[PDB]
Amino acid sequence: SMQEEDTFRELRIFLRNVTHRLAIDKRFRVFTKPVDPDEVPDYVTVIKQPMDLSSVISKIDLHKYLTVKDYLRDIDLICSNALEYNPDRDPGDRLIRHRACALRDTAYAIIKEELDEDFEQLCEEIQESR
Ligand SMILES: [Cl-]
Numbered sequence: 001s002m003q004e005e006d007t008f009r010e011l012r013i014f015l016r017n018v019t020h021r022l023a024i025d026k027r028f029r030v031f032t033k034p035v036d037p038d039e040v041p042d043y044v045t046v047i048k049q050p051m052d053l054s055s056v057i058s059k060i061d062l063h064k065y066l067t068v069k070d071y072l073r074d075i076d077l078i079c080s081n082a083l084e085y086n087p088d089r090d091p092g093d094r095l096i097r098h099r100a101c102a103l104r105d106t107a108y109a110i111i112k113e114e115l116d117e118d119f120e121q122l123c124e125e126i127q128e129s130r
Pocket residue numbers: none
């Protein structure tokens with residue numbers, strides 16, 4: 001229905017705002033663009049599902065997210081990809097892991113404070129009805 005389309009449009013507006021807030025934070029600059037195969041030629045071989053905030057904006061605009069749970073699965077991938085690719089005790093890897101965990105925790109904290117649970121439940125029920 002047009003009412004269900006309005007629901008998904010509100011979801012996209014909400015997810016674009018959350019993603020913009022993460023992308024303008026200087027801590028998360030490394031997560032704003034895909035990894036350059038020049039700097040890192042082994043990345044695309046180790047990480048099977050690369051994800052970054054530019055890709056997340058593209059997915060929002062392609063109507064790939066019908067629930068906040070589907071969005072958070074891609075935020076979780078940004079975090080888990082960084083924990084897997086950068087697992088060493090050296091400060092460079094520790095700094096990327098801390099920044100990836102902070103991204104993920106920030107996204108969840110914004111959603112906990114600003115997403116109505118009844119709005120999420122409505123999205124989940126339209127998605128399940130298709
Ligand atoms: Cl830095």
